[PDB]
Amino acid sequence: GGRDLPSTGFAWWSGNARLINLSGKLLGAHVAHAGLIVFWAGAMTLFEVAHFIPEKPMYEQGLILLPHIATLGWGVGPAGEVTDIFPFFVVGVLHLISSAVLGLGGIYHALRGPEVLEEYSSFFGYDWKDKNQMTNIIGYHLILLGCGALLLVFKAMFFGGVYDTWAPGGGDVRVITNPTLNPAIIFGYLLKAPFGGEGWIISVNNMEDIIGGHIWIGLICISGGIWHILTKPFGWARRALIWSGEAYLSYSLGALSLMGFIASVFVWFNNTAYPSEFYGPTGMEASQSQAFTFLVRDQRLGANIASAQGPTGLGKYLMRSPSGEIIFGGETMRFWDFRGPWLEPLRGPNGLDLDKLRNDIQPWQVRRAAEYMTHAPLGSLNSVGGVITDVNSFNYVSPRAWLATSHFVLGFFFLVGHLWHAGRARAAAAGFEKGIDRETEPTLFMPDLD
Amino acid sequence: MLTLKIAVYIVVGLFISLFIFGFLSSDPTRNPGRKD
Amino acid sequence: MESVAYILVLTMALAVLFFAIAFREPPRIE
Amino acid sequence: GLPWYRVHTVVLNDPGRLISVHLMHTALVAGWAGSMALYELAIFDSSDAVLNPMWR
Amino acid sequence: ASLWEQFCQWVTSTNNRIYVGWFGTLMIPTLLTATTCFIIAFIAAPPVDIDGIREPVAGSLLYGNNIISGAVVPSSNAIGLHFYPIWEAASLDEWLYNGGPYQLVVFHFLIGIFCYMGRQWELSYRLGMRPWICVAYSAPVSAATAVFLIYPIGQGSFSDGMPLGISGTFNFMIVFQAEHNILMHPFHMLGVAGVFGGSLFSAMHGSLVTSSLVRETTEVESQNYGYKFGQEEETYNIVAAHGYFGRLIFQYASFNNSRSLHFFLGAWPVIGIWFTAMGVSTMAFNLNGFNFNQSILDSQGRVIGTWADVLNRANIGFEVMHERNAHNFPLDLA
Amino acid sequence: KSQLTYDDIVNTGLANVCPEISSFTRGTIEVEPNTKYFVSDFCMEPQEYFVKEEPVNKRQKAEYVKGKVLTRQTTSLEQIRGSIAVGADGTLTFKEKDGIDFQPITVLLPGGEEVPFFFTVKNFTGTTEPGFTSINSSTDFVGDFNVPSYRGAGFLDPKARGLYTGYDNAVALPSAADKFRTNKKETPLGKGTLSLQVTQVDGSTGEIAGIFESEQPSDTDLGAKEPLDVKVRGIFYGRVDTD
Amino acid sequence: KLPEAYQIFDPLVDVLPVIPLFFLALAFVWQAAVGFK
Amino acid sequence: MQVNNLGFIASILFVLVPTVFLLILFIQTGK
Amino acid sequence: MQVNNLGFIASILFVLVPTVFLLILFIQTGK
Amino acid sequence: NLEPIFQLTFLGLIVLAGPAVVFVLAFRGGDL
Amino acid sequence: MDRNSNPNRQPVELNRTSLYLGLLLVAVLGILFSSYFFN
Ligand code: CLA
Ligand code: CLA
Ligand code: CLA
Ligand code: CLA
Ligand code: CLA
Ligand SMILES: CC1=C(/C=C/C(C)=C/C=C/C(C)=C/C=C/C=C(C)/C=C/C=C(C)/C=C/C2=C(C)CCCC2(C)C)C(C)(C)CCC1
Ligand SMILES: CC1=C(/C=C/C(C)=C/C=C/C(C)=C/C=C/C=C(C)/C=C/C=C(C)/C=C/C2=C(C)CCCC2(C)C)C(C)(C)CCC1
Ligand SMILES: CCCCCCCCCCCCO[C@@H]1O[C@H](CO)[C@@H](O[C@H]2O[C@H](CO)[C@@H](O)[C@H](O)[C@H]2O)[C@H](O)[C@H]1O
Ligand SMILES: CCCCCCCCCCCCO[C@@H]1O[C@H](CO)[C@@H](O[C@H]2O[C@H](CO)[C@@H](O)[C@H](O)[C@H]2O)[C@H](O)[C@H]1O
Ligand code: OEX
Ligand SMILES: [Ca+2]
Ligand SMILES: [Cl-]
Ligand SMILES: [Cl-]
Ligand SMILES: [Fe+2]
């Protein structure tokens, strides 16, 4: 294929578009880029390990990868205390070396390997219009994805377990012996409203549900992989979809935008797959923690926190949710759907329980609430912690803030890319992506509007 | 209130089904250029 | 009664919109 | 052309536009009814039906 | 042929005065619903307890507001992020008191504007155009989504969505600055560059085209009549415009390719607005503007003020007064 | 709320419902002549709200008007602790001690006036007639309770005027600042009357349920206007510790 | 931090993660060498 | 509300006078 | 003098509206 | 100390690497 | 359906004398009724 504008029709700034029909070069680009991803995983892990002070919390040190490893149950014990630093190092080293291998392969295919693969092999050669081959590649990758989900399941069940922040006796790494395979729970998660108090799938709150849903995901992905290997797209799919490389790219871009938004919300709200031990409190958690901290302090001072009415007439410390549940008062009324391992022991069937509040509060809960209140996910861009009017002496931005902001931004720009490529794929399939033909300008053959 | 909820559910379901089946009705064909 | 004035001006703007769309001067190719 | 007092005679032999102007008049009258009622509701004092009834 | 096919040809018809299309089949109902509810509420909605402290705020004209002060008030802080449709209220009066109209209008409006963007793509496809006008429109859509949905989601309440009113908008902005220092956020600076530069480029482009109009009229009539709709020839001399501009600054800073020029005109404000929309969307997660409070110390250790410290003083002044009865505890975390 | 969990209870409105005892219940709770018994989890669930409208004529019957609650299922007192003492003659004295013993409630009346009031049972001491050697279906605790100001003295009005905080004048009108009567904020301690008709006693477990009717003033907005008369009818439940 | 045996390459791991930014820049270097064909 | 007693006349004329100016010019156009 | 607060608006419109009606008709005449 | 010195050594070597590849290919006649 | 030009439309006229007469009538009606409008 050509490597300039005259021979390709694409400028340098759209040079990767020149690869659309060079399957070998495209494969090289993909493999090298995968090498970039794995390289970042390894290098960032080693950086985080090197810059890790293991007696300080992870979320106080700007770490986003080490929490992922800790959640999987590696190198941590009860309450998230880092037992062994070596497994983090091993994850990083393995990713770095494998990235070397992937980069070598991507360079080979991009620079010297065969330009196209179709006259080399039918198995690896593909045509974008070859619907059966495209569904074959879908099938292979679906099988792989289901296998990866089952790898998560195997780690949680047979290889030491995963970190369970809801464990009795304290959050700890525990082995999940009874995943919920019950499809009612698993698929009723997908039907929950994406609004406050329901939290469509962000509300999954126990590792049994997570592991069981991953068993279901693995089975679904593998069976769909086989289904796509053994069939071709049906008539309705053929009549509804654009069948081109750019169209498939646009479809994947839409999917990725959806996943990016979901991940940003997930890290912002969920404290089960993102234990606060490693990611710090959620904003909801920190607000509730402040309310709890001052309930505890004022109660020790002698305030009768059940009957103390605030300035507006609502309870200063306790109040009712619009459905009647007893909740913390103040602005944190909006966060009454929050559930956390440190707060549920004080919750009764009706909400917060006066008897537990008056005699069941443990010193570790007070310490945890103070920590979470002071590590609220508020911070400046230059990493000054606290409310924006605070002064420069607290260097902290929550990992939840970093992850949520970054992935909302990436989700948005991938929605933009999906719009761009979907529109372009449609126009190119219909053949007017290069502009209006003067001879057959469609609007010239149309009746005037009025 | 329940009558309202049911009516809104039907109205919204009908409009969404319209949108879906419309885009399933060989929409790429509906253009002034190539129909392949 | 200043509510009447506010409603009046808003309705004037909206009526202008409807007439400007429905009864626009047709663009004609000549 | 037509004097000012004869302008509406243009629908004299145009049944469709006679229907049109009748419709517009009907719309104006109905809209007056609705808006008159809305204004009266906006200012009506319902507290004392004995000594402050609608006709006061 | 079939009834469904006939309906499809009608909805996707390019001969309709207003294009409907499949995205339009969602846009029209949702936008009409939002508009009707907005007008009704703005005129006549009763006061709304936005802060969830039984402190209702009058937003409608009939309850003492003018056009500037009127608004559709965001739903109650007690609701938070809960879905509050009409059928979840015990009565219409309860729904109104808790700010249900805001949720109805906002959700329908958001669906409508996303469908408007899809409809722009659809009509471009039906007319044989290039497909990317909707990409430009995605910038205002992103901004509106940031202020009506994303920011309330990150903050955890639709009470922290932008009110649907003029003064409500200003209140939103002032509180936002107090809590996030949006002025000192580089994405908002990029938004300001986007709009200032977009206006600048609009003024230059319009003035350079108007300046280089080819003489086709007399001094009496409007020069606009020198252009005939659908004429093939160019109505201005782009070469003269390039000569003027390349001498105003220098030759190589002036576009002589109209296509590159118009791409630049499209791209600058759109990119700026994308950046500012992302700025609001990320300040939704409290990743705030720069904090240089007490960044400059003298040798002894006393703080030397900068303009950032004065700005922080203004922010604190806004911060301590806003929602004066809503806070019970020292830190404004919610 | 029966005997569920919070997962079963959340977002249902059951959290705002006082428990009920049973149907086949006509027991009585024996009491000693001069000992006092703790009340464990006292609940009051209002169901009807009436506001005494004020005629402009004069001297004419005011006719309580039925209101509707604009605030949601946030209207119930619960987890209240108290005590019942048996007087020398046989009097039964119910004394509220603490708990979630207040809820702000806003009711809408026909005509558009919204009436916030501080529904409460605070410091309620109520008594029966003498000669009660048991708690039964005839036990009527009629008594008084305190009604604090709806808005506390830390509240600020829309012009940042308050009692122990805020301005004491209309700062937006510099030449007429001290002219307005609402420049002075007030928090009078209003008074209420309550009756607790016990209708159902399960002496085995000690739970008592019944009906209540309460009379109390509404919000004055820190003395901005005269309080209306609000009447609340509802039901109640509590456990009485026999031992 | 890094296990003890590895802390002589601590100032190397400090700069590793930023390399893909250099890859993105290198794309432009390569296109500039070929004259942005 | 105690609003300016000249508000109604000011607003109505503010709208009305330019409105009739435009109406006159438009209707006579083509004479 | 305590006059009707609608007197100014009523009188001004009473004169103004027919005035602009006549003005429109006269100015467009001959079109 | 020496940490910035070694850091800048690694950084500068890495920085030169890519341009070194492009320069060598351009000068030796490789494909670009 | 088609939008066909309506052949029943006619020009309206108000000559200068009619304008003066109408303006005088309006002015004198205003003179007459303003006192009663003010009351
Ligand atoms: C997997 C995702 C993916 C893939 C495979 C593609 C692939 C392609 N895109 Mg595309 N795109 C995407 C996502 C993707 N895109 C997204 C998310 C957007 C929204 C922004 C776009 C918007 C887009 C446009 C407008 C165009 C393409 C085009 C193309 C084609 C050529 C592009 C090229 O040569 O690169 C060249 C690379 C550059 C010129 C460098 C760009 C650098 C960016 C702008 C900034 C990087 C910022 C990054 C975060 C790092 C920050 C650095 C900081 C430290 C300073 C190509 C097939 C072109 C096309 O349509 O071809 C027919 C084209 O016109 N895309
Ligand atoms: C992930 C990023 C990425 C990847 C994988 C690719 C990949 C590719 N691009 Mg591309 N591109 C990119 C980003 C990327 N691009 C960006 C951001 C721009 C805008 C500036 C472009 C603009 C562009 C244009 C205009 C063209 C391409 C082309 C190509 C293809 C041919 C490569 C070639 O011959 O050049 C040769 C370059 C060299 C020989 C220099 C050395 C390159 C090697 C790989 C450096 C590796 C260094 C590494 C550290 C060493 C480790 C080795 C090992 C020990 C691990 C190829 C598959 C061409 C094409 O489409 O072919 C038909 C083409 O014409 N691109
Ligand atoms: C998805 C990534 C991918 C894909 C689709 C391909 C595809 C291809 N490669 Mg390539 N390659 C890759 C990555 C990839 N490669 C990487 C990362 C490297 C660096 C090591 C190479 C280095 C390389 C060289 C040097 C050559 C190829 C060649 C080929 C072509 C012939 C393949 C063949 O029949 O040989 C045989 C395939 C097998 C015997 C199957 C072995 C499968 C692997 C090696 C074992 C591991 C399987 C593993 C468990 C599955 C999951 C992987 C795991 C990481 C998750 C073919 C189109 C050849 C070519 O182009 O012909 C002229 C060629 O000479 N590749
Ligand atoms: C990445 C994974 C992947 C990809 C790319 C595909 C791709 C495809 N599949 Mg599929 N599939 C998969 C995984 C995947 N599949 C798995 C894991 C299974 C096992 C369950 C299946 C089982 C399956 C079947 C039975 C069929 C396909 C078919 C297809 C083809 C057309 C279907 C279509 O238009 O999609 C889009 C879906 C629609 C247009 C229907 C509308 C669905 C609703 C109305 C959309 C609403 C979504 C909602 C907004 C999102 C909320 C999330 C949740 C709450 C629901 C297409 C190429 C069809 C085919 O042609 O087979 C050869 C087909 O019959 N697949
Ligand atoms: C159903 C009732 C009705 C209808 C349909 C008509 C219809 C007609 N009349 Mg007629 N008329 C009516 C009742 C009616 N009239 C009554 C009650 C009287 C006695 C006052 C007259 C005395 C009358 C005369 C002397 C003439 C007509 C003429 C005409 C014709 C031309 C109208 C025109 O252009 O003037 C246009 C009018 C204007 C441009 C300005 C009018 C402004 C008025 C004075 C004030 C408007 C007040 C308010 C807006 C009206 C609502 C009040 C409502 C409650 C009645 C037309 C067919 C003319 C004719 O015969 O043509 C050959 C003609 O010379 N009418
Ligand atoms: C195609 C192309 C491209 C791309 C490329 C790429 C994408 C690549 C890559 C690549 C890669 C992706 C790579 C890699 C690598 C790796 C390595 C080379 C490694 C290693 C290792 C080591 C050496 C390590 C060490 C260590 C250890 C062992 C532990 C301790 C620490 C340390 C670190 C010391 C561009 C755009 C430029 C353009 C042209 C074309
Ligand atoms: C693991 C887990 C889980 C699970 C989950 C699951 C199981 C899931 C799933 C899921 C799924 C299973 C999904 C899905 C999806 C779908 C989609 C996303 C779609 C679509 C669509 C489309 C895209 C379409 C389009 C169209 C139209 C609209 C019409 C026309 C044609 C077309 C194609 C264009 C749980 C939560 C339990 C727990 C946690 C973890
Ligand atoms: C065309 C698309 C398809 C359209 C079909 C969908 C039709 C609409 C179905 C809506 C179903 C009604 O949904 C039903 O709402 C009632 C309201 O009484 C809920 O009922 C529950 O909550 C309500 C409060 O709202 C309580 O008063 C009630 O006692 C309790 O059972 C049910 O839990 C739910 O099942
Ligand atoms: C401090 C002094 C000023 C510093 C200036 C730094 C900026 C200078 C330009 C940066 C590099 C731009 O790189 C420039 O790209 C142009 C594209 O027109 C290419 O231009 C060149 O291409 C190739 C070089 O291989 C030649 O055959 C061709 O005739 C020539 O046009 C070159 O690659 C380089 O001249
Ligand atoms: O609501 Mn509207 O602004 Ca968001 O910060 Mn907390 O919440 Mn309230 O206080 Mn500041
Ligand atoms: Ca180091
Ligand atoms: Cl405010
Ligand atoms: Cl608070
Ligand atoms: Fe232009």
Side-chain angles (χ1 to χ4, degrees), chain A residues 50-51, chain G residues 9-14, chain J residues 3 7:
Chain A
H51 296 239
Chain G
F9 296 3
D10 177 56
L12 172 75
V13 295
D14 285 335
Chain J
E3 179 122 358
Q7 270 166 191

mmCIF file of all heavy atoms in Angstrom, chain A residues 50-51, chain G residues 9-14, chain J residues 3 7, ligand 11:
data_model
loop_
_atom_site.group_PDB
_atom_site.id
_atom_site.type_symbol
_atom_site.label_atom_id
_atom_site.label_comp_id
_atom_site.label_asym_id
_atom_site.label_seq_id
_atom_site.Cartn_x
_atom_site.Cartn_y
_atom_site.Cartn_z
ATOM 1 N N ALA A 50 7.678 1.353 43.507
ATOM 2 C CA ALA A 50 8.827 2.146 43.931
ATOM 3 C C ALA A 50 8.394 3.333 44.780
ATOM 4 O O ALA A 50 9.033 3.649 45.789
ATOM 5 C CB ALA A 50 9.611 2.623 42.709
ATOM 6 N N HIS A 51 7.307 4.000 44.390
ATOM 7 C CA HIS A 51 6.768 5.137 45.123
ATOM 8 C C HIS A 51 5.725 4.729 46.153
ATOM 9 O O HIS A 51 4.831 5.522 46.470
ATOM 10 C CB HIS A 51 6.171 6.156 44.152
ATOM 11 C CG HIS A 51 7.169 6.769 43.223
ATOM 12 N ND1 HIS A 51 7.397 8.127 43.168
ATOM 13 C CD2 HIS A 51 7.995 6.210 42.307
ATOM 14 C CE1 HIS A 51 8.325 8.377 42.263
ATOM 15 N NE2 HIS A 51 8.703 7.232 41.725
ATOM 16 N N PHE G 9 18.266 0.603 40.308
ATOM 17 C CA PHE G 9 17.504 1.001 39.128
ATOM 18 C C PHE G 9 16.215 1.733 39.488
ATOM 19 O O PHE G 9 15.337 1.898 38.638
ATOM 20 C CB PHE G 9 17.226 -0.216 38.236
ATOM 21 C CG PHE G 9 18.472 -0.865 37.659
ATOM 22 C CD1 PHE G 9 19.734 -0.406 37.979
ATOM 23 C CD2 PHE G 9 18.375 -1.972 36.844
ATOM 24 C CE1 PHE G 9 20.859 -0.991 37.449
ATOM 25 C CE2 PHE G 9 19.510 -2.568 36.330
ATOM 26 C CZ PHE G 9 20.745 -2.074 36.637
ATOM 27 N N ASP G 10 16.104 2.188 40.738
ATOM 28 C CA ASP G 10 15.068 3.136 41.147
ATOM 29 C C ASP G 10 14.994 4.406 40.303
ATOM 30 O O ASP G 10 13.876 4.824 39.964
ATOM 31 C CB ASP G 10 15.283 3.482 42.626
ATOM 32 C CG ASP G 10 14.303 4.515 43.134
ATOM 33 O OD1 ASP G 10 13.083 4.284 43.024
ATOM 34 O OD2 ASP G 10 14.754 5.551 43.666
ATOM 35 N N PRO G 11 16.092 5.084 39.949
ATOM 36 C CA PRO G 11 15.939 6.270 39.102
ATOM 37 C C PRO G 11 15.640 5.945 37.652
ATOM 38 O O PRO G 11 15.361 6.866 36.875
ATOM 39 C CB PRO G 11 17.275 6.989 39.281
ATOM 40 C CG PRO G 11 18.254 5.880 39.421
ATOM 41 C CD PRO G 11 17.503 4.652 39.930
ATOM 42 N N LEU G 12 15.693 4.674 37.260
ATOM 43 C CA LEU G 12 15.214 4.269 35.948
ATOM 44 C C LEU G 12 13.716 3.998 35.946
ATOM 45 O O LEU G 12 13.018 4.404 35.012
ATOM 46 C CB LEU G 12 15.966 3.028 35.467
ATOM 47 C CG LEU G 12 15.388 2.426 34.190
ATOM 48 C CD1 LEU G 12 15.754 3.283 32.991
ATOM 49 C CD2 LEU G 12 15.856 0.997 33.998
ATOM 50 N N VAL G 13 13.199 3.323 36.977
ATOM 51 C CA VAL G 13 11.762 3.072 37.028
ATOM 52 C C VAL G 13 11.002 4.381 37.192
ATOM 53 O O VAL G 13 9.806 4.451 36.894
ATOM 54 C CB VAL G 13 11.410 2.073 38.146
ATOM 55 C CG1 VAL G 13 12.016 0.704 37.856
ATOM 56 C CG2 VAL G 13 11.830 2.594 39.503
ATOM 57 N N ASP G 14 11.677 5.434 37.658
ATOM 58 C CA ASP G 14 11.033 6.734 37.807
ATOM 59 C C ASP G 14 10.568 7.296 36.469
ATOM 60 O O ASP G 14 9.605 8.070 36.430
ATOM 61 C CB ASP G 14 11.990 7.721 38.473
ATOM 62 C CG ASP G 14 12.146 7.482 39.969
ATOM 63 O OD1 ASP G 14 11.237 6.923 40.609
ATOM 64 O OD2 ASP G 14 13.203 7.855 40.504
ATOM 65 N N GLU J 3 19.965 11.489 42.454
ATOM 66 C CA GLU J 3 18.776 10.934 41.812
ATOM 67 C C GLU J 3 18.343 11.732 40.591
ATOM 68 O O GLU J 3 18.060 11.111 39.552
ATOM 69 C CB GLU J 3 17.633 10.801 42.825
ATOM 70 C CG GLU J 3 16.347 10.253 42.221
ATOM 71 C CD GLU J 3 15.865 8.986 42.907
ATOM 72 O OE1 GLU J 3 16.564 8.517 43.830
ATOM 73 O OE2 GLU J 3 14.793 8.461 42.523
ATOM 74 N N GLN J 7 18.243 10.171 36.831
ATOM 75 C CA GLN J 7 16.946 10.271 36.179
ATOM 76 C C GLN J 7 17.067 10.982 34.843
ATOM 77 O O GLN J 7 16.504 10.540 33.839
ATOM 78 C CB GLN J 7 15.967 11.019 37.074
ATOM 79 C CG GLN J 7 15.184 10.161 38.027
ATOM 80 C CD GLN J 7 14.514 11.001 39.087
ATOM 81 O OE1 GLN J 7 13.988 10.485 40.065
ATOM 82 N NE2 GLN J 7 14.539 12.314 38.900
HETATM 83 CA CA CA L 11 13.103 6.587 42.354
#
